[PDB]
Write a protein that binds this ligand. Structure first.
Ligand code: TZ4
Ligand code: TZ4
Ligand code: NAG
Ligand code: NAG
Lengths: 536, 535
């Protein structure tokens, strides 16, 4: 028995496993239960703390993936399969993982907590791209990641009911955060320096913890990559979650009031619920997800828009950013004319039609406005332009402009904000060239995977990943991503509403740019709401 | 006796002209030739009638009366304004034209250029210094003709459907002068089978209206439109709106409005200056770049809106040169936008910018104005008073001239026309408007007419060569339908404007540079999105 691999937490003893990182050993504790299995009558319910266990709990393997839809568009293609469950599906999935340095840190170390994405309908903390091994080994970080319930299991809501109050997957995350406060010191983590970070839905989740008072005492800094709590896909109104839950129930034969409806849903096999998950969306669309956090008046006291507009963010530090082609990869999930297996050169007609699908809530006038803005009037019918514009429309509406308004609002209201745009395309990428640097493809680099020589990343990419791991952990450590030794430029400046400085993350040294897609986001954040607003 | 080269006969009767001095040598000039019966008394508001023949030799050595007309007094003594003001007596008796020809008159029939002045349809005169045809005549061998046409109420006050005030009579004055060139210009050595209309601002819009009005089409062969178009927000009005303004003007001088004969009769008894004193008071909103009495869509001269006629017209044979100056809007701003003056830098606040946009785009709803403001804001420096000043100028320039021109070039080119397009980017060294106004509306004319060739005017040597270059493009175009020089291989070429390639040229001190899209992103906002708003 290795004494470094034995830990006592509140609930009992645990045995981890020494894993190999290229620079040396790390201690990993995988599959640690943080809640009572949310099964049977606990489906749709807020999670309860895990009861104490006897003996030594085996924490050497990843635990089950939360029940979710599995992608079937491109079977056995790396670019999709890399996001698919890599363990057994089960409703019994409330476990987290901890990577620490080996030997365990001598003095308390800043803690990073990862929250995965997947549109609140998918994801898992066990995917190879979320491997905490590298960050633990090179930067000496204590890295934590939890599973949280997704799809119906995490977010089906009958608002105001006792037995489907909504947002429970966000409560799973909050419970993992509390678990960290109570327990991370036993691993040599510092519960007094916790940085949340996440991508896509994970980034929106981090956003939600910023916006929810009970979460605030559980972290000190935040990183939101390619996602925000504001914007068109991350939340729904109470009225709208009730409609979808009700509709899903109708779809699976329930009922033959809220209590009855939820009791009958509870009798249904998990796959029955996933079978009809997609059919509750109000419009033909892309970048919209059936079961997401609901504006409940509880976890979320008002809309994320109202909350960001009026919040006090004085002692908060935030790192936010986007990748170069946020919307490209989404296009093949519903826009006629797009495929990964050809160059996807579209007609003008295919563009107008794709806009109604990229901006599913847009009126004729509003979609006309989108079209007229994104057209290159010098080359109005050029298929390459039209394709890139369609991708641009989706990236901007869903990620880049929501990010830009989050950054401005936080900065204006006392927070310390650092922003980036990530522009390096992975040499190993399996999606076609026209998709560029798609949603999700920075993660790989932040987590330090290019340092594994067996993964065939170029030398330049390894150095690049070393730089990114240093920014992220510098940020966790201090709230400032800059290397406090060196001494030479260019320094990453804070983002502000005046100057609007952000940096390009790519193979070249940091470049400072101003204005995060400024004219275009003004279109989305200031004009379009007004459209659309008073009419209709 | 008497210079034998200055005696000519027209339909008409005998004319005596004057030998004038141009820098390169003598030109012939026949100034103040009457082409209509004086449109006075029972004839105010009425279409013009042909001038009745005279006896003896009519003296044609001095400019005749300017049409009666508001005189600018915003900046008294200031050359930037006084250069546009009347330079002869104001009279309703003003329907006269001018002819410049080489001296001695040309051997073989020469291409004719007919100038039509601007001034918002409320002002202008063919006798102004900047419209002097002596240089084009002497240097290019051109026959140049310019006419006075009635402006303001006299030219354009309309009670659509009536006998007594049908509207568009100023346009009809221009047509009559065109008919006169057909019958008579051969007497001066002009070629009636090669007549090119050119004009700037309202002159340009006028030219466009002759293109769109069938009876005018047989009277010219080619057309040049400088900083103006028949389509756009200011060049025309509906029948309903012209009726409203005429009626209101009537009231103000009242003349209590009750059929149309009684009302026009009463308006007819009013003194000219009195109509001018109230002209401005009929505008539906506080505005700039809007004029009270302009061409009306009558279903006669203009069979439908200029927009409908350009969208559906067939322009197979037509050759047009079209263009704009770098700063179309700047000088309009001192005539009504709070915050702007010629005597300071006119740095403005964001509030003053929003307030200006409502005045510059007076027909706009709150939704449309906010669209304008958001489009023109520099979101990186949204409070910068220099940028706000410049945005306000572009808002006015784009809405009133650049985008209506771009729309025009696009439609004509799509429907058979050969179109050539320019942006004029040189600031006269002699300009007296402040530096912030850039190259304002009107300030290419001076160069097209070759004024810099007069050494007494203090232009630079390069300005002299530049004016020479321009006179040469314009008269090549008149001559051949192509502004390019056929012999001159090395000089850069001026390609036609097409929908596919949207090419146009920079006119400045440097050799021609070919650019693409005038000025596509922004004009898509005005011509494609904004109407669809708005509405
Ligand atoms: N016939 C059906 C039945 C059920 C579902 C179906 C289709 C679809 C669907 C599949 C193809 C085309 C249209 C629709 N869908 C739609 C899923 C597709 C939408 C997301 C795809 C996507 C694309 N990207 C950008 C590129 N990178 C990623 C991904 C994926 N996941 C992630 C997760 C985190 C970060 C990045 C990332 C997964 C897919 C591929 C790329 N992110 N997500 C379902 C969804 C449900 N919630 C429930 C059931 C079903
Ligand atoms: N208090 C009064 C009473 C009556 C009139 C008044 C004001 C005004 C006015 C004056 C100052 C400020 C606001 C309003 N106006 C306003 C007219 C002012 C708008 C025209 C000024 C202008 C400015 N530009 C651009 C610069 N270049 C030119 C000009 C002018 N003319 C020309 C003609 C062709 C090409 C260029 C050019 C004349 C003036 C200055 C510059 N073009 N035109 C009136 C108009 C009428 N039709 C009748 C009466 C009155
Ligand atoms: C310029 O003068 C005008 C009118 O006299 C005035 O309203 C404006 O405030 C002045 N602008 C500046 C920058 O001083
Ligand atoms: C031109 O130049 C001279 C200075 O050499 C000046 O005295 C004269 O008045 C000027 N004339 C004009 C029209 O500006």
């Amino acid at each position: 028995e290795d004494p470094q691999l034995l830990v006592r937490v509140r609930g009992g003893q645990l045995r981890g496993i020494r894993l190999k990182a290229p620079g040396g050993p790390v201690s990993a504790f995988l599959g640690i239960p943080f809640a009572e299995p949310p099964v049977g009558s606990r489906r749709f319910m807020p999670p309860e703390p895990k009861r104490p266990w006897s003996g030594v709990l085996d924490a050497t393997t990843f635990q089950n993936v939360c029940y979710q839809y599995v992608d079937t568009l491109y079977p056995g293609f790396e670019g999709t399969e890399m996001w698919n469950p890599n363990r057994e599906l089960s409703e019994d999935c409330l476990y987290l993982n901890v990577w620490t340095p080996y030997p365990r840190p001598a003095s308390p170390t800043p803690v990073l907590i990862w929250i995965y994405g997947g549109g609140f309908y998918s994801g898992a903390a066990s995917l190879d791209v979320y491997d905490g091994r590298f960050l633990a080994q090179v930067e000496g970080a204590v890295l934590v990641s939890m599973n949280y319930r997704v799809g119906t299991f995490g977010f089906l809501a009958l608002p105001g009911s006792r037995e489907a109050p909504g947002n429970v997957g966000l409560l799973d995350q909050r419970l993992a955060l509390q678990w960290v406060q109570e327990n991370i010191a036993a691993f040599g983590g510092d519960p007094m320096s916790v940085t949340l970070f996440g991508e896509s839905a994970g980034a929106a989740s981090v956003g939600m913890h910023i916006l929810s008072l009970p979460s605030r005492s559980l972290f000190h800094r935040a990183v939101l990559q390619s996602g925000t709590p504001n914007g068109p896909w991350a939340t729904v109104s109470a009225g709208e979650a009730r409609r979808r839950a009700t509709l899903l129930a109708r779809l699976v034969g329930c009922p033959p009031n809220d209590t009855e409806l939820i009791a009958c849903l509870r009798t249904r096999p998990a796959q029955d619920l996933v079978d009809h998950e997609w059919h509750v969306l109000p419009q033909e669309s892309i970048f919209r997800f059936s079961f997401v956090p609901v504006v409940d008046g509880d976890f979320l006291s008002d809309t994320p828009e109202a909350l960001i507009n009026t919040g006090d963010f004085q002692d908060l530090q935030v790192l936010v950013g986007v990748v170069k082609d946020e919307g490209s990869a989404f296009l093949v999930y519903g826009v006629p004319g797009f495929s990964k297996d050809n160059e996807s050169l579209i007609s003008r007609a295919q563009f107008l039609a794709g806009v109604r699908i990229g901006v599913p809530q847009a009126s004729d006038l509003a979609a006309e406005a989108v079209v007229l803005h994104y057209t290159d009037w010098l080359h109005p019918e050029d298929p390459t332009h039209l394709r890139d514009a369609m991708s641009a429309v989706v990236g901007d509406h869903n990620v880049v402009c929501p990010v830009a308004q989050l950054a401005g609002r936080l900065a204006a209201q006392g927070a310390r904000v650092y922003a980036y745009i990530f522009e390096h395309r992975a040499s190993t990428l399996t999606w076609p060239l026209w998709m560029g640097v798609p949603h999700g493809y920075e993660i790989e680099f932040i987590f330090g995977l290019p340092l594994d020589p067996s993964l065939n990343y170029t030398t330049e990419e390894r150095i690049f990943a070393q730089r990114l791991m240093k920014y992220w952990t510098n940020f966790a450590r201090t709230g400032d991503p800059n290397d406090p030794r060196d001494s030479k430029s260019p320094q990453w400046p804070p983002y502000t509403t005046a100057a609007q400085q952000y940096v390009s993350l790519n193979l070249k040294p940091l470049e400072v740019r101003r204005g995060l897609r400024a004219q275009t986001c003004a279109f989305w954040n200031r004009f379009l709401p007004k459209l659309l607003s008073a009419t209709a």
